[PDB]
Design a protein around this ligand. Structure first.
Ligand SMILES: CC(C)CCCCCCC[C@@H](C)CCC[C@@H](C)CCO[C@H](CO)COCC[C@@H](C)CCC[C@H](C)CCC[C@@H](C)CCCC(C)C
Ligand SMILES: CC(C)CCCCCCC[C@@H](C)CCC[C@@H](C)CCO[C@H](CO)COCC[C@@H](C)CCC[C@H](C)CCC[C@@H](C)CCCC(C)C
Ligand SMILES: CC(C)CCCCCCC[C@@H](C)CCC[C@@H](C)CCO[C@H](CO)COCC[C@@H](C)CCC[C@H](C)CCC[C@@H](C)CCCC(C)C
Ligand SMILES: CC(C)CCCCCCC[C@@H](C)CCC[C@@H](C)CCO[C@H](CO)COCC[C@@H](C)CCC[C@H](C)CCC[C@@H](C)CCCC(C)C
Ligand SMILES: CC(C)CCCCCCC[C@@H](C)CCC[C@@H](C)CCO[C@H](CO)COCC[C@@H](C)CCC[C@H](C)CCC[C@@H](C)CCCC(C)C
Ligand SMILES: CC(C)CCCCCCC[C@@H](C)CCC[C@@H](C)CCO[C@H](CO)COCC[C@@H](C)CCC[C@H](C)CCC[C@@H](C)CCCC(C)C
Ligand SMILES: CC(C)CCCCCCC[C@@H](C)CCC[C@@H](C)CCO[C@H](CO)COCC[C@@H](C)CCC[C@H](C)CCC[C@@H](C)CCCC(C)C
Ligand SMILES: CC(C)CCCCCCC[C@@H](C)CCC[C@@H](C)CCO[C@H](CO)COCC[C@@H](C)CCC[C@H](C)CCC[C@@H](C)CCCC(C)C
Ligand SMILES: CC(C)CCCCCCC[C@@H](C)CCC[C@@H](C)CCO[C@H](CO)COCC[C@@H](C)CCC[C@H](C)CCC[C@@H](C)CCCC(C)C
Ligand SMILES: CC(C)CCCCCCC[C@@H](C)CCC[C@@H](C)CCO[C@H](CO)COCC[C@@H](C)CCC[C@H](C)CCC[C@@H](C)CCCC(C)C
Ligand SMILES: CC(C)CCCCCCC[C@@H](C)CCC[C@@H](C)CCO[C@H](CO)COCC[C@@H](C)CCC[C@H](C)CCC[C@@H](C)CCCC(C)C
Ligand SMILES: CC(C)CCCCCCCCCCCC[C@@H](C)CCCCCCCC(C)C
Ligand SMILES: CC(C)CCCCCCCCCCCC[C@@H](C)CCCCCCCC(C)C
Ligand SMILES: CC(C)CCCCCCCCCCCC[C@@H](C)CCCCCCCC(C)C
Ligand SMILES: *C\C=C(C)/C=C/C=C(C)/C=C/C1=C(C)CCCC1(C)C
Ligand SMILES: *C\C=C(C)/C=C/C=C(C)/C=C/C1=C(C)CCCC1(C)C
Ligand SMILES: *C\C=C(C)/C=C/C=C(C)/C=C/C1=C(C)CCCC1(C)C
Lengths: 222, 222, 222
């Protein structure tokens, strides 16, 4: 269509869809209780992103936000997506290391505050206050990364596999507040079409890429 | 009022309300931990549907959606209702057979994608894309029904009782995408007032009817 | 600003923020699994209220609702806040007395119906129906208070500490439907600026005040 970023949303739609079918097929046969949970998560996440990428693609998951005296296209569907996939991602890391419930609850709550305030910042029409919501969101993200780094006698296999995903998580997740900031939602240093491209690359990395990593470990099996 | 379907929403309001009081009364005295969960579920579900039927009844849970060049009344309150009652229904079946968490999470996630995309399809103004969201929703429903059918040494009583509800669930739940499709949200083969009637009959069947079945079994007791 | 109630939202923003940092600091070092959950809850709750008080403060969490032939300012952000903090509050009481899951689910579901219908009543433009939603909300609150009072061999320390919070909960929570009723959302006996003040005093009492109580008990430790 006219939306130059359409190509990226259409690519992202396809990769998430293809990833869901892949995990769906691979997930056939798992009987192991524990392995089951990881499989559930690794398949649910691209499945949610799929519906959200397609809603952005069809124009449903998009709104206009007036700020800086202009009507600014805002894909709220990215946030609806992250609202459900990030806690699930967090769940898989906590199950991995058998984290305590209390910690799990900290993180999930932490995470919803994170997505929640980014959404608010995205939809805020007073330009300045946008970045205020950004900073709080970012602060919740740092909280979360702090816990995954500095809060965790597991089998060496789990230790090893979690070390990897944890290092992935820091670098991926960290990238998000930077794209937002440079993209059209923030300072507008990068146009919408490059903005959409970057988030798609991260989303696919974070959805499908992360899961491909995780299900390759036998740390997920009881 | 002027909305011919008002009678159906008013009837449905009354039956859900009456059902909540019935399960509330019947639920007095249960001390059994396990029985408790089933009682919670069987009472919560008509209680939620009650508030949603009344919101449609008062006109709050209703919006207009322009498609086919006409303003089309859409009861989003049906979806808000199904968003919370269907996973609870699913929970009761999984507890019944002691399903694994991973499976439970599959289903609930599956289920939210189901309701979520129907809502999107209902609110989508490009007529054609409506049915695209329909098909994905339906695909999530088939996923779910597949798992309940082909995924489950329980006491014979549980086995027996689950066989029943499982057969109920297939036939009830299956009816929904068919009414949507023939109703005003889809191809408009059936008018709004008959559409509302059909969903009310299913909702009461699915809410109160299903629960009356379930609490009659001693499969729910420890 | 022009909104006379701004001072109250700005005060409330500060107290919730200060409370989050306090619980955050105090929560450093807890290793006890169980104590962990209480700490998570006691810190998450003011953290959520913080983001909601600030959104009301910046004008984001506010809408206009026409009723009585006038445009009536409605802080929906109070409800978004209560939607997430009240079940967490309820969780802490149930963990305290080790309540059964089924009971927990009763309460949380009960609680969402409570906040949900108040939000609907707040946003309902037919003046009369507002109070209908009020009464249902209030009925769910009475349900909840009934269970906390009449539904619970714990260590004497837990017994003792729960008796206190339970008496706090009744008096605090009960105050809410009364302020709503006398405030601008209901009969308009009290102006918006006094209305906002009262809810702020309750919110801080209910958020920070309640948590300060709870974390002082060693009933929270295993
Ligand atoms: C937990 C524990 C922690 C909680 C975190 C605390 C932070 C709370 C913030 C929350 C508040 C969200 C605000 C937002 C949903 C309200 C939208 O109003 C906008 C401003 O007029 C309207 O935009 C016009 C259009 C916009 C569209 C927004 C819709 C989005 C949908 C995302 C939610 C999903 C929907 C699930 C339904 C299936
Ligand atoms: C920062 C706090 C201590 C932490 C809590 C967060 C609350 C405050 C967020 C930072 C804040 C004021 C950003 C202010 C942006 C300001 C330049 C707005 C520009 O004003 C111009 C008219 O007045 C609008 O031109 C519009 C032209 C635009 C291109 C201007 C771009 C603005 C940029 C803001 C990005 C802030 C990032 C530095 C934060 C890095 C740390
Ligand atoms: C974007 C990449 C840099 C470029 C692509 C190449 C991938 C390199 C990723 C950089 C990072 C990876 C760091 C390696 C890790 C290994 C550490 O694991 C140790 C196991 O003993 C634990 O130490 C404890 C580990 C602690 C590590 C701190 C976190 C890391 C730093 C992540 C950087 C952030 C991204 C900044 C955002 C930017 C993209 C806008
Ligand atoms: C999990 C795991 C799996 C997640 C499933 C993935 C699919 C995600 C889809 C979600 C997105 C929902 C979209 C929708 C909520 C946003 C509404 O925007 C409409 C389009 O302009 C506006 O309609 C105008 C009015 C409309 C009204 C819609 C409101 C409805 C309310 C239902 C939610 C409930 C509210 C709870 C509050 C008490
Ligand atoms: C189907 C895919 C393979 C699966 C994924 C879903 C994506 C596509 C959904 C099916 C799809 C195109 C439906 C197309 C409807 C099409 C007739 C729209 C009609 O176009 C007319 C003007 O162009 C509008 O008249 C308006 C008059 C209306 C009464 C037309 C009614 C349309 C009906 C559509 C119902 C589709 C059900 C068959 C699907 C049965 C399988
Ligand atoms: C089978 C699977 C997906 C089916 C592929 C379809 C591709 C659509 O055809 C192209 C027209 O040349 C897209 O243009 C159509 C214009 C617009 C593009 C719509 C593309 C997407 C809405 C369709 C992709 C899948 C759909 C829903 C498939 C649901 C699945 C779970 C059964
Ligand atoms: C709408 C009704 C047909 C009419 C009203 C009369 C009620 C008859 C319901 C039909 C169905 C019930 C099938 C019986 C079941 C019994 C099977 O249980 C077996 C226990 O050994 C398990 O086999 C494995 C069982 C497998 C069964 C497959 C699922 C069933 C078929 C359900 C049909 C669907 C509804 C199609 C939607 C339509 C309403 C638009
Ligand atoms: C469980 C178990 C029990 C369930 C309880 C049953 C009761 C269900 C009621 C629910 C329905 C909620 C209705 C409401 C969300 C829809 C808003 O539509 C309004 C009427 O046109 C529009 O107001 C215009 C603006 C308004 C703004 C409302 C937004 C608020 C946001 C609160 C939700 C949070 C968002 C999380 C995202 C981060
Ligand atoms: C009550 C049921 C048995 C329980 C279920 C709840 C459903 C009904 C709620 C009560 C109900 C009708 C409230 C009716 C308010 C009525 C006075 C509206 C006033 O009508 C005037 C024009 O017709 C509007 O003046 C506007 C002037 C305003 C200042 C009028 C204020 C109205 C007040 C209503 C407060 C009701 C509290 C008593 C309920 C105490 C119990
Ligand atoms: C007691 C229980 C319900 C009370 C019944 C009331 C019936 C309302 O009276 C009729 C006027 O002749 C409805 O017209 C009123 C015009 C409109 C219809 C409103 C009907 C519903 C809004 C009222 C049904 C129950 C209400 C809320 C009851 C809450 C309950 C939990 C205490
Ligand atoms: C607002 C306050 C009254 C004024 C400020 C002074 C604080 C006094 C709070 C009043 C209440 C506290 C009752 C004391 C409690 C102690 C009971 O604990 C017993 C332990 O053996 C259990 O008995 C079983 C206990 C049962 C107790 C019934 C609940 C209580 C009554 C709460 C009143 C409600 C608030 C009415 C709302 C109003 C604020 C608009
Ligand atoms: C076992 C394999 C081959 C899995 C195939 C699943 C297919 C879908 C997506 C999986 C690919 C992801 C690789 C890691 C993550 C990313 C950094 C991908 C960046 C996206 C941009 C283009 C890369 C090419 C692709 C077509 C995979
Ligand atoms: C123990 C009994 C009698 C329970 C009474 C609870 C009352 C409320 C609703 C319960 C009835 C549901 C029966 C099964 C489900 C359905 C197929 C009902 C279809 C609805 C249409 C009219 C039927 C008559 C009714 C008034 C129950
Ligand atoms: C250990 C202590 C001092 C904790 C400090 C945390 C700071 C933030 C808020 C905590 C205060 C709450 C006390 C109980 C609850 C309320 C009834 C407060 C009513 C609010 C109005 C003004 C009162 C003064 C305050 C500045 C605390
Ligand atoms: C798709 C899945 C992943 C891992 C998404 C992660 C997203 C974030 C970490 C987003 C963070 C945000 C913050 C920190 C700043 C404000 C806005 C964002 C929502 C982009
Ligand atoms: C009220 C409780 C029950 C069991 C409701 C069940 C509803 C469904 C199975 C709905 C399914 C939908 C699908 C499959 C197709 C798109 C739209 C619907 C939401 C009607
Ligand atoms: C901030 C935390 C607390 C404990 C909030 C509690 C709020 C309530 C008990 C609210 C109750 C409502 C009812 C009973 C009546 C309709 C509207 C309200 C949402 C105010």
């Amino acid at each position: 269509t006219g939306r130059p970023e359409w190509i990226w949303l259409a690519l992202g739609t396809a990769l998430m869809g293809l990833g869901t079918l892949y995990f769906l097929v691979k997930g056939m046969g798992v009987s192991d209780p524990d392995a089951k949970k990881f499989y559930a998560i690794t398949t649910l996440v691209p499945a949610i992103a799929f519906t959200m990428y397609l809603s952005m693609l069809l124009g449903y998951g998009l709104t206009m936000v007036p700020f800086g005296g202009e009507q600014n296209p805002i894909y709220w569907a990215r946030y609806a997506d992250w609202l459900f996939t990030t806690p699930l991602l967090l769940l898989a890391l906590a199950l991995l290391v058998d984290a305590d419930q209390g910690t799990i609850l900290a993180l999930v709550g932490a995470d919803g505050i994170m997505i929640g305030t980014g959404l608010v910042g995205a939809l805020t029409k007073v330009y300045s206050y946008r970045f205020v919501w950004w900073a709080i969101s970012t602060a919740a993200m740092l909280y979360i990364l702090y816990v995954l780094f500095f809060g965790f006698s597991m089998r060496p296999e789990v230790a090893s596999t979690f070390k990897v995903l944890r290092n992935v998580t820091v670098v991926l997740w960290s990238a998000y507040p930077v794209v937002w900031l440079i993209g059209s939602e923030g300072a507008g240093i990068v146009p919408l079409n490059i903005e959409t491209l970057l988030f798609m690359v991260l989303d696919v990395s974070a959805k499908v890429g992360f899961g491909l990593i995780l299900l390759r470990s036998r740390a997920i099996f009881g």
